[PDB]
Amino acid sequence: VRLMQSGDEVKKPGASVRLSCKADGYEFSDYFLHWVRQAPGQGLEWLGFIRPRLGSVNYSKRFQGRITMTRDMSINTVYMELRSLTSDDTAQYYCARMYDTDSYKFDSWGWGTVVIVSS
Amino acid sequence: NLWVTVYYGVPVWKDAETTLFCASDHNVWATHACVPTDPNPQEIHLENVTEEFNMWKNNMVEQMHTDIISLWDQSLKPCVKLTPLCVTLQCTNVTNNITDDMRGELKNCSFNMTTELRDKKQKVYSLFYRLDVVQINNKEYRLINCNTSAITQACPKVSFEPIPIHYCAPAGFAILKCKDKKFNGTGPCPSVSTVQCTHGIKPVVSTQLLLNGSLAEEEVMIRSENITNNAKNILVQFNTPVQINCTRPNNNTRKSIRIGPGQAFYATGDIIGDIRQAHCNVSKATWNETLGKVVKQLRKHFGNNTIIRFANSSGGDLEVTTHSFNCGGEFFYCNTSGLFNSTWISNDSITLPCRIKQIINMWQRIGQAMYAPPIQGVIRCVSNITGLILTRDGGSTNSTTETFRPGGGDMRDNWRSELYKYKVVKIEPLGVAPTRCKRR
Amino acid sequence: PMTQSPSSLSISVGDRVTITCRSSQYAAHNVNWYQQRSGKPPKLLIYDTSKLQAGVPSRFRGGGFGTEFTFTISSLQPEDVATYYCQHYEFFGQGTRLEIT
Amino acid sequence: GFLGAAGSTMGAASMTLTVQARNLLSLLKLTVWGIKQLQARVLAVERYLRDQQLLGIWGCSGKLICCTNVPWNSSWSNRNLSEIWDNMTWLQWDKEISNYTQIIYGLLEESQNQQEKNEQDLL
Amino acid sequence: GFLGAAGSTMGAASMTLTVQARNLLSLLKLTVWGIKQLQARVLAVERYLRDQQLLGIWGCSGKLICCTNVPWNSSWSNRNLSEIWDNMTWLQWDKEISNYTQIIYGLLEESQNQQEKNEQDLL
Amino acid sequence: GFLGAAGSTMGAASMTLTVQARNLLSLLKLTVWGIKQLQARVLAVERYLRDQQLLGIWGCSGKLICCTNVPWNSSWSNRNLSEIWDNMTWLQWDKEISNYTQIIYGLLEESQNQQEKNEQDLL
Ligand SMILES: *[C@@H]1O[C@H](CO)[C@@H](O[C@@H]2O[C@H](CO)[C@@H](O[C@@H]3O[C@H](CO[C@H]4O[C@H](CO)[C@@H](O)[C@H](O)[C@@H]4O)[C@@H](O)[C@H](O[C@H]4O[C@H](CO)[C@@H](O)[C@H](O)[C@@H]4O[C@H]4O[C@H](CO)[C@@H](O)[C@H](O)[C@@H]4O)[C@@H]3O)[C@H](O)[C@H]2NC(C)=O)[C@H](O)[C@H]1NC(C)=O
Ligand SMILES: *[C@@H]1O[C@H](CO)[C@@H](O[C@@H]2O[C@H](CO)[C@@H](O[C@@H]3O[C@H](CO[C@H]4O[C@H](CO)[C@@H](O)[C@H](O)[C@@H]4O)[C@@H](O)[C@H](O[C@H]4O[C@H](CO)[C@@H](O)[C@H](O)[C@@H]4O)[C@@H]3O)[C@H](O)[C@H]2NC(C)=O)[C@H](O)[C@H]1NC(C)=O
Ligand SMILES: *[C@@H]1O[C@H](CO)[C@@H](O[C@@H]2O[C@H](CO)[C@@H](O[C@@H]3O[C@H](CO[C@H]4O[C@H](CO)[C@@H](O)[C@H](O)[C@@H]4O)[C@@H](O)[C@H](O)[C@@H]3O)[C@H](O)[C@H]2NC(C)=O)[C@H](O)[C@H]1NC(C)=O
Ligand SMILES: *[C@@H]1O[C@H](CO)[C@@H](O[C@@H]2O[C@H](CO)[C@@H](O[C@@H]3O[C@H](CO)[C@@H](O)[C@H](O)[C@@H]3O)[C@H](O)[C@H]2NC(C)=O)[C@H](O)[C@H]1NC(C)=O
Ligand SMILES: *[C@@H]1O[C@H](CO)[C@@H](O[C@@H]2O[C@H](CO)[C@@H](O)[C@H](O)[C@H]2NC(C)=O)[C@H](O)[C@H]1NC(C)=O
Ligand SMILES: *[C@@H]1O[C@H](CO)[C@@H](O[C@@H]2O[C@H](CO)[C@@H](O)[C@H](O)[C@H]2NC(C)=O)[C@H](O)[C@H]1NC(C)=O
Ligand SMILES: *[C@@H]1O[C@H](CO)[C@@H](O[C@@H]2O[C@H](CO)[C@@H](O)[C@H](O)[C@H]2NC(C)=O)[C@H](O)[C@H]1NC(C)=O
Ligand SMILES: *[C@@H]1O[C@H](CO)[C@@H](O[C@@H]2O[C@H](CO)[C@@H](O)[C@H](O)[C@H]2NC(C)=O)[C@H](O)[C@H]1NC(C)=O
Ligand SMILES: *[C@@H]1O[C@H](CO)[C@@H](O[C@@H]2O[C@H](CO)[C@@H](O)[C@H](O)[C@H]2NC(C)=O)[C@H](O)[C@H]1NC(C)=O
Ligand SMILES: *[C@@H]1O[C@H](CO)[C@@H](O[C@@H]2O[C@H](CO)[C@@H](O)[C@H](O)[C@H]2NC(C)=O)[C@H](O)[C@H]1NC(C)=O
Ligand SMILES: *[C@@H]1O[C@H](CO)[C@@H](O)[C@H](O)[C@H]1NC(C)=O
Ligand SMILES: *[C@@H]1O[C@H](CO)[C@@H](O)[C@H](O)[C@H]1NC(C)=O
Ligand SMILES: *[C@@H]1O[C@H](CO)[C@@H](O)[C@H](O)[C@H]1NC(C)=O
Ligand SMILES: *[C@@H]1O[C@H](CO)[C@@H](O)[C@H](O)[C@H]1NC(C)=O
């Protein structure tokens, strides 16, 4: 099971960044995909998850409104778009795969995509 | 002295899995093929028995899901494949007697079909909803499911009305029903009663609002495998039903087209009269009362002094973002943003604008579509919103507010609201016990 | 949310370590532990606080059922230098950094 | 009726067995429901036949309550007969004997064969 | 042979039963005839099993002619034994008693259970 | 275990029968393997039922070793009992009697019916 992310990005404050996450090696319908961000020198933080089966989403209350996650089953990718970027959004964003809905089990993680928001 | 003694027929059961057949008192679900249920159902109350039920680990729901999918497939098999319909349509916008709410929602598409003769063509028009056509870059459009799946016309005699079906376990098996009216869904049930068949479950297909379901008795019930978990749908069962009135005001006319020998494609002819958006009505006072009752039973798991907010769906396909259902032969996708637009701190009718889709990708299976034939006349429907399928937004900020948004899509949650109290057990009538007797 | 403690601790190779995971709400057994090497993506070791994910060596073990959870690695190794994260459902915890003395 | 004495006492449950013994057994089109009904019928038939075969191997065919000549090791259960048959039902009895049951069956059949052979010796 | 004594007297018909008792039970391709044969086999098996289960519940398994301890209410039939067993066959007998069968069956099983318990008391 | 006494002596093979008697009986999808399994289950059920019906017609149901009152014509086999039960197994025994089986079976059932009638006369 391999989750290949997208390329390190640099955005100006106030812009929107769309990360991607390609998943292969497993049936891209049974396992939900979460987006976990990590600030430099800080702990992991959960952004939200998406069910690839029907595109159902669930975003964290802190990032609600500024975030939107879509999926594309043909190319087998999950995309996350973050709007109104500010300075403290400089982070590494990972895409994890939850094995079971109960006992959240982030088995496979992506390489990570560092978004740098600066002027 | 003491010795073994074998007893046959002892009341001992173990939880197990088996095939449950159908009993009922044409149709997509083969109700006729079901055995006739007994006119007087037999149910035995059990005294001083405790059994551990689990609605979410139940197996009967999976069997029902597989059975409904199989019935759908077996009803769509012997009827018209619409592969010739995947052709370049030349579409315009219908503008004759359209209100402001349906500006461009319907397309007058004219296109060439093969006729009953192989070497002759046929220039024929039809009316396609905007959701069933995608532009190609009058303009050029094509059916939405022409590059992903093959369409099979929902074949006009079969009816989609959910006829109740009873799931009867075979001989040697029983079904324990949890009669406890305060059963939250996962745990011991003091009041267990043995039955042979279920209580006529209606295979109602809906996503955000459970329609025509079985209601609770004591109060509104909140069921979830893990309320703390945010990946688990929260089923809400109402004690009193909320009536919802569904309507498609357009007076559609079905037009038959000969696309081959015997094969006929039923298109939407010119709508006679005025074109108006399909919509739903729900009593505002009744809905507010039901939401208040739900919040009252929802604050228990989150404590008092917490803010309970209902907001609309956060995203996804048209099946999960909108309350999707099927009645009258037509599939409605209703924007339930008016319903879930409330905040709760410790004659008027809400109108939901609905859209109609004919290219139906039922059971979220990519590779098998279905064209719902036009239904003649004006469609009206009256349904009971028996329950809800909510989902709690994740995260934890400084504020203590909780936002619940409608969910769905997974029909297992839809059919788990009827099989929650039921469990299938295998009888073990052989039992050994001490006694002071010997054979002579 | 989690209150994973301590922030960091210096431990010699082969020594037993303990990482308390005092929670704030009833978590039952649905608590998992992640090992994030410096720079590398986090890797999962223990799920359900008892079971061990395949491919993880048996020195790692977990415990606790209520609002307190413990993480032990028995015999520390040079390749066990990383950060260790609690995880109950959505919420993670402040990491524990292992430094070789 | 059926399974009515599930929570009843061991002796009272043993008194009534036919009411839950009759219900252990009671064109063809290969639709979704037809194949399920066929599977249900075959499953019921084979389960009843397996139970009756186990009963008949131990020389208890046709008898709801049948005694046996095999001894009962005290390791199986040290509980007294009065509390077993007066303050307890069949469910937890199966729960606290389940793992032992598998060996007792063997003893059962052995005894029967021996007894049968003895009869052929005596008669 | 089979059903030969259908018109024969009640006693003579009762004398011979095996000839019409053996014939109560006696690759797979899912064609038109194969599914019919499978249904026929399953139907025969389940009918024979139901009949044998009814026989064994009344403590008459393995016995073509079996007596019972329950009484016979004269309302069921006031006809004398001589005319019943000498000037009449089984068919018209079944027609006039078909409406009292179920209760009779119940009585049957009850006695058996009672009878069984009695041996467990006596033996 | 199963069929272990196939080469064993007639008496030794007759001593052990349960071990090879239990194994005579032990969702649905109409795939190749599903239909093969369904045929196998139905075949096993019907074969066991046929064998049990033949046993019960002769008044030997539930008895692995059962005696009968019918005579044995010396034409069937003139071999002495000692050599039959001490220097020869069941297979070659079946080979030399397979052509007298049917009549024997008939005699069997006849006796049973007669015996049953006699019982109904005596009791
Ligand atoms: C929750 O539960 C409620 C109630 O159970 C349910 O509402 C019911 O929905 C069904 C949907 O099938 C409705 O049934 C339809 O009703 C219309 C109108 O019926 C009234 O009017 C007719 C005369 O117009 C009266 O005879 C009748 O008694 C009612 O008063 C009917 O017109 C429909 O008939 C067509 O469909 C049937 C089933 O397919 C056919 O058997 C019938 O012959 C008709 O089809 C044929 O004729 C058409 C016209 O000629 C032709 O165009 C077709 O192609 C075909 O040839 C149908 O019976 C029912 O009325 C609703 N009841 C109420 C009280 O509202 C909800 O839908 C349900 N919610 C869910 C499932 O989400
Ligand atoms: C749940 O409820 C919320 C509101 O509570 C809904 O949010 C609205 O969603 C609709 C979707 O159509 C939005 O309507 C569209 O707005 C576009 C403008 O977006 C800009 O401005 C907003 C703020 O106003 C920014 O957030 C955004 O980033 C953009 O900068 C229009 O361009 C669209 O126009 C299209 O449709 C109209 C329809 O008539 C056509 O006339 C146009 O030609 C064009 O085709 C469109 O109007 C609306 O803005 C959203 N509101 C808010 C406050 O964000 C959710 O959609 C709803 N979810 C569900 C599932 O029901
Ligand atoms: C639906 O009803 C169920 C039954 O009432 C609920 O399950 C119970 O939920 C309560 C509160 O959430 C739990 O109470 C906690 O218990 C722990 C101790 O755990 C005990 O149970 C576990 C079961 O595995 C056992 O292993 C332990 O040894 C304990 O014996 C306390 O430490 C807490 O402080 C708290 O009191 C129950 O434990 C729990 N029981 C079971 C069997 O699950 C369920 O929560 C309800 N669901 C909803 C959505 O309301
Ligand atoms: C079958 O055809 C449909 C319709 O053409 C395909 O869906 C479309 O797929 C394209 C990508 O190939 C999507 O384009 C994307 O649009 C978003 C904005 O929505 C934009 O941000 C992206 O950069 C990209 O351009 C398009 O939106 C999408 N259309 C719809 C209605 O979802 C579908 O992929 C085809 N199936 C295949 C190729 O298997
Ligand atoms: C959809 O377009 C078709 C085009 O054929 C319309 O049907 C024709 O409309 C013209 C209008 O001048 C009539 O003269 C023809 O008799 C109609 N039929 C045919 C076969 O050409 C149809 O009315 C349009 N529907 C709309 C706009 O709702
Ligand atoms: C049905 O087929 C005809 C013939 O193939 C199409 O008419 C042609 O359209 C092209 C595109 O403009 C022209 O170059 C040809 O000269 C037309 N030929 C004739 C004979 O008219 C027609 O467009 C097709 N129908 C639709 C709805 O597209
Ligand atoms: C919607 O709910 C109402 C209320 O439960 C249903 O009407 C009741 O149905 C029960 C059936 O057991 C009857 O006992 C009540 O007398 C009915 N009450 C009334 C006022 O009619 C109604 O049938 C439901 N509608 C649908 C379509 O299921
Ligand atoms: C649902 O509610 C709407 C609006 O409350 C109703 O629409 C009214 O319909 C009548 C009859 O056609 C008109 O005279 C009114 O002008 C309409 N009101 C509005 C605001 O459009 C509708 O009748 C209700 N029922 C159904 C089945 O839709
Ligand atoms: C939904 O429609 C039903 C009718 O199908 C409405 O109920 C009827 O309303 C009329 C007008 O007030 C009354 O005369 C009837 O007695 C009502 N019958 C029943 C069974 O309720 C209902 O009011 C409508 N509700 C909404 C929200 O549109
Ligand atoms: C669902 O309904 C809501 C109304 O509650 C729609 O929200 C409006 O959408 C229009 C269309 O762009 C905007 O002009 C309004 O400002 C919106 N109002 C509010 C209060 O949100 C929403 O767009 C609908 N969603 C659909 C049709 O997908
Ligand atoms: C036709 O309707 C579509 C909406 O479906 C709209 O985008 C387009 O501008 C319309 N064309 C007209 C009115 O000419
Ligand atoms: C919450 O408030 C209700 C009254 O509205 C009360 O019955 C209940 O005990 C309270 N729960 C607490 C304080 O945990
Ligand atoms: C729809 O049109 C038909 C035919 O014109 C008519 O009989 C029927 O009453 C109409 N239905 C309406 C207007 O609801
Ligand atoms: C989640 O649900 C499962 C099954 O009902 C239960 O065992 C577990 O304790 C629950 N955990 C929480 C945190 O509620």
PDB file of N, CA, C and O in Angstrom, chain E residues 49-75:
ATOM      1  N   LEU E  49     -38.739 -36.778   6.403  1.00  0.00           N
ATOM      2  CA  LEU E  49     -38.229 -36.355   7.701  1.00  0.00           C
ATOM      3  C   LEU E  49     -39.338 -35.803   8.585  1.00  0.00           C
ATOM      4  O   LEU E  49     -39.353 -36.057   9.792  1.00  0.00           O
ATOM      5  N   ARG E  50     -40.270 -35.041   8.010  1.00  0.00           N
ATOM      6  CA  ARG E  50     -41.390 -34.532   8.796  1.00  0.00           C
ATOM      7  C   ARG E  50     -42.248 -35.672   9.329  1.00  0.00           C
ATOM      8  O   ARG E  50     -42.644 -35.668  10.503  1.00  0.00           O
ATOM      9  N   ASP E  51     -42.533 -36.665   8.484  1.00  0.00           N
ATOM     10  CA  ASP E  51     -43.333 -37.799   8.937  1.00  0.00           C
ATOM     11  C   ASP E  51     -42.623 -38.568  10.046  1.00  0.00           C
ATOM     12  O   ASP E  51     -43.241 -38.936  11.054  1.00  0.00           O
ATOM     13  N   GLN E  52     -41.319 -38.803   9.887  1.00  0.00           N
ATOM     14  CA  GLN E  52     -40.577 -39.540  10.905  1.00  0.00           C
ATOM     15  C   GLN E  52     -40.467 -38.744  12.199  1.00  0.00           C
ATOM     16  O   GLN E  52     -40.490 -39.323  13.289  1.00  0.00           O
ATOM     17  N   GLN E  53     -40.337 -37.420  12.104  1.00  0.00           N
ATOM     18  CA  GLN E  53     -40.307 -36.593  13.304  1.00  0.00           C
ATOM     19  C   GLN E  53     -41.636 -36.650  14.043  1.00  0.00           C
ATOM     20  O   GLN E  53     -41.663 -36.748  15.276  1.00  0.00           O
ATOM     21  N   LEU E  54     -42.750 -36.590  13.309  1.00  0.00           N
ATOM     22  CA  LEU E  54     -44.052 -36.727  13.953  1.00  0.00           C
ATOM     23  C   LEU E  54     -44.194 -38.091  14.615  1.00  0.00           C
ATOM     24  O   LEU E  54     -44.759 -38.202  15.709  1.00  0.00           O
ATOM     25  N   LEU E  55     -43.696 -39.143  13.962  1.00  0.00           N
ATOM     26  CA  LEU E  55     -43.751 -40.471  14.569  1.00  0.00           C
ATOM     27  C   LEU E  55     -42.910 -40.541  15.838  1.00  0.00           C
ATOM     28  O   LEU E  55     -43.343 -41.106  16.849  1.00  0.00           O
ATOM     29  N   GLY E  56     -41.701 -39.975  15.805  1.00  0.00           N
ATOM     30  CA  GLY E  56     -40.804 -40.055  16.944  1.00  0.00           C
ATOM     31  C   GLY E  56     -41.179 -39.169  18.108  1.00  0.00           C
ATOM     32  O   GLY E  56     -40.793 -39.462  19.244  1.00  0.00           O
ATOM     33  N   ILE E  57     -41.915 -38.087  17.853  1.00  0.00           N
ATOM     34  CA  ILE E  57     -42.384 -37.241  18.945  1.00  0.00           C
ATOM     35  C   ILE E  57     -43.393 -37.995  19.804  1.00  0.00           C
ATOM     36  O   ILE E  57     -43.418 -37.849  21.032  1.00  0.00           O
ATOM     37  N   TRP E  58     -44.218 -38.832  19.180  1.00  0.00           N
ATOM     38  CA  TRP E  58     -45.225 -39.612  19.887  1.00  0.00           C
ATOM     39  C   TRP E  58     -44.675 -40.908  20.466  1.00  0.00           C
ATOM     40  O   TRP E  58     -45.461 -41.746  20.920  1.00  0.00           O
ATOM     41  N   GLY E  59     -43.359 -41.093  20.461  1.00  0.00           N
ATOM     42  CA  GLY E  59     -42.772 -42.321  20.968  1.00  0.00           C
ATOM     43  C   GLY E  59     -43.123 -43.546  20.155  1.00  0.00           C
ATOM     44  O   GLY E  59     -43.311 -44.630  20.722  1.00  0.00           O
ATOM     45  N   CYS E  60     -43.217 -43.401  18.832  1.00  0.00           N
ATOM     46  CA  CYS E  60     -43.557 -44.509  17.947  1.00  0.00           C
ATOM     47  C   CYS E  60     -42.542 -44.666  16.822  1.00  0.00           C
ATOM     48  O   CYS E  60     -42.841 -45.311  15.812  1.00  0.00           O
ATOM     49  N   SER E  61     -41.353 -44.085  16.973  1.00  0.00           N
ATOM     50  CA  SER E  61     -40.335 -44.179  15.937  1.00  0.00           C
ATOM     51  C   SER E  61     -39.906 -45.626  15.742  1.00  0.00           C
ATOM     52  O   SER E  61     -39.674 -46.356  16.709  1.00  0.00           O
ATOM     53  N   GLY E  62     -39.805 -46.041  14.482  1.00  0.00           N
ATOM     54  CA  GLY E  62     -39.430 -47.398  14.155  1.00  0.00           C
ATOM     55  C   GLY E  62     -40.544 -48.413  14.262  1.00  0.00           C
ATOM     56  O   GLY E  62     -40.297 -49.602  14.025  1.00  0.00           O
ATOM     57  N   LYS E  63     -41.756 -47.991  14.608  1.00  0.00           N
ATOM     58  CA  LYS E  63     -42.899 -48.885  14.742  1.00  0.00           C
ATOM     59  C   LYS E  63     -43.979 -48.445  13.768  1.00  0.00           C
ATOM     60  O   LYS E  63     -44.457 -47.307  13.839  1.00  0.00           O
ATOM     61  N   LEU E  64     -44.359 -49.343  12.858  1.00  0.00           N
ATOM     62  CA  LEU E  64     -45.438 -49.033  11.927  1.00  0.00           C
ATOM     63  C   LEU E  64     -46.774 -48.932  12.649  1.00  0.00           C
ATOM     64  O   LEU E  64     -47.590 -48.058  12.336  1.00  0.00           O
ATOM     65  N   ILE E  65     -47.015 -49.813  13.614  1.00  0.00           N
ATOM     66  CA  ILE E  65     -48.222 -49.791  14.431  1.00  0.00           C
ATOM     67  C   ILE E  65     -47.797 -49.537  15.868  1.00  0.00           C
ATOM     68  O   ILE E  65     -47.054 -50.336  16.450  1.00  0.00           O
ATOM     69  N   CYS E  66     -48.266 -48.431  16.439  1.00  0.00           N
ATOM     70  CA  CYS E  66     -47.861 -48.014  17.775  1.00  0.00           C
ATOM     71  C   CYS E  66     -49.086 -47.603  18.575  1.00  0.00           C
ATOM     72  O   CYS E  66     -49.918 -46.832  18.088  1.00  0.00           O
ATOM     73  N   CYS E  67     -49.186 -48.109  19.799  1.00  0.00           N
ATOM     74  CA  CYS E  67     -50.295 -47.787  20.681  1.00  0.00           C
ATOM     75  C   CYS E  67     -49.968 -46.553  21.520  1.00  0.00           C
ATOM     76  O   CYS E  67     -48.814 -46.138  21.643  1.00  0.00           O
ATOM     77  N   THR E  68     -51.007 -45.965  22.107  1.00  0.00           N
ATOM     78  CA  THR E  68     -50.859 -44.744  22.885  1.00  0.00           C
ATOM     79  C   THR E  68     -51.780 -44.806  24.096  1.00  0.00           C
ATOM     80  O   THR E  68     -52.787 -45.517  24.102  1.00  0.00           O
ATOM     81  N   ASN E  69     -51.419 -44.047  25.130  1.00  0.00           N
ATOM     82  CA  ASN E  69     -52.131 -44.062  26.399  1.00  0.00           C
ATOM     83  C   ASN E  69     -53.218 -42.999  26.508  1.00  0.00           C
ATOM     84  O   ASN E  69     -53.947 -42.992  27.506  1.00  0.00           O
ATOM     85  N   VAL E  70     -53.352 -42.107  25.531  1.00  0.00           N
ATOM     86  CA  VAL E  70     -54.326 -41.022  25.649  1.00  0.00           C
ATOM     87  C   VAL E  70     -55.721 -41.582  25.394  1.00  0.00           C
ATOM     88  O   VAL E  70     -55.867 -42.583  24.677  1.00  0.00           O
ATOM     89  N   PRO E  71     -56.762 -40.995  25.972  1.00  0.00           N
ATOM     90  CA  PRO E  71     -58.123 -41.468  25.712  1.00  0.00           C
ATOM     91  C   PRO E  71     -58.641 -40.957  24.374  1.00  0.00           C
ATOM     92  O   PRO E  71     -58.039 -40.105  23.719  1.00  0.00           O
ATOM     93  N   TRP E  72     -59.786 -41.504  23.976  1.00  0.00           N
ATOM     94  CA  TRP E  72     -60.454 -41.141  22.731  1.00  0.00           C
ATOM     95  C   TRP E  72     -61.848 -40.636  23.077  1.00  0.00           C
ATOM     96  O   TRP E  72     -62.696 -41.406  23.541  1.00  0.00           O
ATOM     97  N   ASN E  73     -62.080 -39.345  22.854  1.00  0.00           N
ATOM     98  CA  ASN E  73     -63.398 -38.770  23.080  1.00  0.00           C
ATOM     99  C   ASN E  73     -64.374 -39.282  22.029  1.00  0.00           C
ATOM    100  O   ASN E  73     -64.080 -39.259  20.830  1.00  0.00           O
ATOM    101  N   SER E  74     -65.546 -39.736  22.482  1.00  0.00           N
ATOM    102  CA  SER E  74     -66.519 -40.334  21.575  1.00  0.00           C
ATOM    103  C   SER E  74     -67.026 -39.349  20.530  1.00  0.00           C
ATOM    104  O   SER E  74     -67.576 -39.777  19.509  1.00  0.00           O
ATOM    105  N   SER E  75     -66.859 -38.045  20.762  1.00  0.00           N
ATOM    106  CA  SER E  75     -67.274 -37.059  19.770  1.00  0.00           C
ATOM    107  C   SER E  75     -66.478 -37.190  18.479  1.00  0.00           C
ATOM    108  O   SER E  75     -66.972 -36.822  17.407  1.00  0.00           O
TER     109      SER E  75
END
